[PDB]
């Protein structure tokens, strides 16, 4: 209910005349804050009526209410991340409400998780001598936390942010590798010429983002993770943590089908590091 | 409910004699399940009375309870992370006892959260020119996270885990910087170095870290976030997610901070992906 | 003088029919090492005199030298670098001709410096807040290389091979701001998307790479680093030293300009390295 | 003939008090610029002829020389690096003294080339599944540099400048694999634990660094290369050189080690570039 970012969400289901109301807001809320109703038609190029027909469309009682709920819209940390943050929100507000968006996010992942894909995401990998994680920007972190989770699993982990090494170690996987390609929006161009080289190479392609995407149209397996955050124009933040949390499981799985013998091996992973911390 | 995982974590409740049995047994789960109470007792040097007494110490109803607990946990996966995993279990047990794990580790955080640490590392960051993250293994990857989400925040983002980076960069802040040090165990001990360097400079040190260890005890501000998760033993998962979101609240806080000048900066920011990104 | 690599070289000089030849050379030299001339002729499609022209236009006495140094060309080594390495060679010959040809390479790079392109390149940097170096592979090893020698002058240093972090970063440099962009091709297609953002942008542009290339044409200040290694072909090796000790010359250069108060922040900085390094 | 630069070098070969006078100077030249022969002595609390010794020690011909000297000697370059800069250097003057210095380190590196363990590592490393690269600062892009080179030599290839992520790494590694473990100082302490790590593991160490050292004393193969460049002082540029054209004979020798077979394999790496570089 921060009316900007329910402005920017409901373009679509818009009036053509009253998307032009709709952009011209998202673009100065300000402005129209301290408009009258003749100010902003003739700003815009509309008719009055669009104008209230515009608020209603949004949930709004009419002229007045459009004013108020956008001067309680602009916080300016509403426009950094899809949080419904108002104006005078404070951290006891912010916080609470940034990890009940998460929590909701993820509870709404695992209730429309694809357990089949799941299944055979994990043993594609874990028949793999190389899994490479391949993303950008936000996607390229959640990349190298994958790539120090997995690397102790009896395989070889590696993860590429610069397109370049994506493609030039993309080429040489065999069809028994696995690459793991990381997007929120599924529509990031390099990455979709990455995808085809891990496709051309015969090795198996396990897309992590949104079903009906370029990217997810590419996938040997498709992971379908329909996180509602929309990155072109808010930061992503929830979309990685669900990018994590399926990383983990894809860990745990591969992890549950190596022997007994890996607890040896991860005895010996953690032993490694006690010159490097001070004991409890 | 893994057998081996709660004998681990419940070794320091037990007497010194049951101490030797559950040493013996999360060494070699295996051995101790085809052996006789006397074979084991003879093996780990104690009395068989010590065996049943560590049994029910544990929850156990005896020994013959203890060895089939004990084979209902051998997965190999309840040893790469801490989730109550058990041999039997399928991809849609794990997959969701992860979730919920991570879930309700997640709101143990906001349940506890010190609001007013919180309010404190925002306005240091919303006062400074330089915020710099440091961390190693996991906690290197939350930093890199953390600088993708704060570089766009009106100030000079940094993130380092190479120690000889942190300590060169860190004498170099001035007093209104912050560096933030990200760690489970706030027992890293290049980390402390590091840390004690910020202190040095005369900068804000913020620790993202459990209360009462080492690191915290160095903070001007301490965020206190308390994950159990034994990362001596598992694979930091769950506390990595904990510290992202907290991340995501200092950034929510910083960009509040900020005039409405920040929209049109981060219009900019998303603007510049149009090239590289497909369009909707 | 390693007679596939030069083929490679000289195959723009070429007769038409000739070049046809050059190709299925450089695709096959075994296969021709066995072949009768008559056999070459019927596999490529072209005249025997065509051949043999082809030789004499590469340097070859006739046919049976063709073959003779062909032999001599099949080092494998000699198709990972440009480095005249033959079949025969040890390691005392090819340590010594790697260097004496880096070192040659280095010497023709001196002699065709652009000593005023530098000084504009060092006063751009020494008046800037930030300056940032962009690069993809060899060019992003070399971008990360930069950073750890600028970042210790008194100005805010980064490095992206990401090009999306490229993108978002280079948009919120300000006029007075700094970019390098690194490539040895100057035709890498996502660095001069980030370069175009950086002159939108209003900073300088400095571009480290060869003359009369696309990179090159965006210049605020092109450095025209004509090293001639054919990375279409060869890993590069040779161009990324070159680069490295030109950014040598301009961190001296930004150093020069500031004032005797750098002495005493680097002596800060190596101070901070005492805890990490053993004594000498 | 930095005069600053040449004290600092030879501390060792002076007098007790010649030394006192020494240290004093490198703290604070511009001081004694302006100091009497009196005021100096009494200020380092020494004689008026332990100053005039010491100017002589140090190849100046009296106390007016030295002065003359110090001023000539006041270029913040010459404090960023350990070239032979003055005053009044331009960068005609500068870019030339830089690359000429670095073209005497690799002639001087090149002539005290250990062909022999060149030979050995480069063996060791032909027979290995896995190659990693570990360093620190300057030596931590080095390790990347490398890793970019190497991945495409037909075995799995790795760089950390995470001690943490070295320690874990280097555990897993097989008798068979190598490290190879990059310092001009030798005597980083968590580089130490890393190569011990290597060696508890039975795999082979290579350690690019110089002979005598801490470092050095651990490997398996000790590559020797003793640039003369003091890193507790200035910051390491011509050392890095050197250990990036030793790196190039490192993969050069490994790729002279692999089949005929290589070619098409750097065939693929090279066209997987074709959608991300422009044509020539
Ligand atoms: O930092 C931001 O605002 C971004 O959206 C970066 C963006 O390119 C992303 O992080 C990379 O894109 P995808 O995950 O491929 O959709
Ligand atoms: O990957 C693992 O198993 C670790 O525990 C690495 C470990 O050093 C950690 O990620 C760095 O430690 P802290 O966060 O400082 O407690
Ligand atoms: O590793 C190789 O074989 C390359 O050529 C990678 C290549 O894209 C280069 O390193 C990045 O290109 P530029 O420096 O931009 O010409
Ligand atoms: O950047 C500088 O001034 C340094 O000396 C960093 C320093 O720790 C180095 O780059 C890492 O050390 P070594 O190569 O191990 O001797």
């Given at each position: 209910?921060?009316?900007?970012?329910?402005?920017?969400?409901?373009?679509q289901?818009?009036?053509?005349?009253?998307?032009?109301v709709?952009?011209?807001?998202?673009?100065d809320?300000?402005?129209?804050?301290?408009?009258?109703?003749?100010?902003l038609?003739?700003?815009?190029?509309v008719?009055?009526?669009?104008?209230?027909?515009?608020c209603?469309?949004?949930?709004?009682?009419?002229?007045?209410?459009?004013?108020?709920?956008?001067?309680?819209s602009?916080?300016?940390?509403?426009?950094?991340?899809?949080?419904?943050?108002?104006?005078?929100?404070?951290?006891?507000?912010?916080?609470l409400?940034?990890?009940?968006t998460?929590?909701?996010?993820?509870?709404?992942?695992?209730?429309?998780?694809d357990?089949?894909?799941?299944?055979?995401?994990?043993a594609?990998?874990?028949?793999?001598?190389?899994?490479?994680?391949?993303?950008?920007?936000?996607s390229?972190?959640?990349?190298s936390?994958?790539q120090?989770?997995?690397?102790?699993?009896?395989?070889?982990?590696?993860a590429?942010?610069?397109?370049?090494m994506?493609?030039?170690?993309?080429?040489?996987?065999?069809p028994?590798?696995?690459?793991?390609?990381?997007?929120?929006?599924g529509?990031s161009?390099?990455?979709?010429?990455?995808?085809?080289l891990?496709?051309?190479?015969?090795?198996?392609?396990?897309?992590?983002?949104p079903?009906?995407?370029?990217?997810?149209?590419?996938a040997?397996?498709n992971?379908?993770?329909?996180?509602?955050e929309?990155?072109?124009?808010?930061?992503?933040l929830?979309?990685?943590?669900?990018?994590?949390?399926?990383?983990?499981?894809?860990?745990?799985?591969?992890?549950?089908?190596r022997?007994?013998?890996?607890?040896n091996?991860?005895?010996?992973?953690?032993?490694?590091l006690?010159?490097l911390?001070?004991?409890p």
């Amino acid at each position: 209910m921060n009316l900007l970012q329910h402005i920017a969400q409901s373009r679509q289901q818009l009036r053509k005349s009253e998307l032009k109301v709709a952009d011209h807001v998202l673009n100065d809320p300000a402005s129209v804050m301290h408009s009258s109703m003749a100010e902003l038609a003739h700003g815009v190029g509309v008719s009055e009526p669009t104008i209230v027909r515009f608020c209603r469309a949004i949930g709004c009682s009419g002229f007045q209410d459009l004013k108020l709920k956008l001067a309680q819209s602009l916080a300016a940390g509403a426009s950094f991340g899809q949080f419904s943050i108002h104006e005078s929100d404070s951290v006891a507000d912010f916080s609470l409400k940034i990890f009940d968006t998460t929590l909701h996010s993820l509870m709404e992942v695992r209730e429309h998780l694809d357990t089949h894909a799941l299944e055979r995401a994990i043993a594609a990998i874990a028949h793999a001598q190389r899994v490479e994680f391949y993303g950008f920007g936000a996607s390229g972190a959640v990349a190298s936390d994958a790539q120090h989770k997995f690397f102790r699993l009896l395989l070889s982990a590696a993860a590429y942010s610069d397109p370049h090494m994506q493609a030039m170690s993309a080429v040489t996987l065999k069809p028994s590798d696995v690459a793991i390609c990381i997007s929120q929006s599924g529509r990031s161009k390099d990455l979709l010429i990455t995808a085809n080289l891990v496709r051309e190479a015969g090795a198996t392609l396990i897309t992590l983002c949104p079903s009906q995407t370029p990217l997810a149209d590419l996938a040997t397996v498709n992971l379908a993770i329909d996180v509602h955050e929309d990155t072109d124009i808010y930061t992503p933040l929830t979309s990685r943590i669900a990018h994590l949390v399926v990383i983990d499981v894809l860990a745990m799985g591969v992890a549950m089908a190596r022997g007994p013998d890996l607890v040896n091996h991860l005895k010996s992973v953690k032993r490694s590091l006690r010159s490097l911390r001070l004991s409890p």
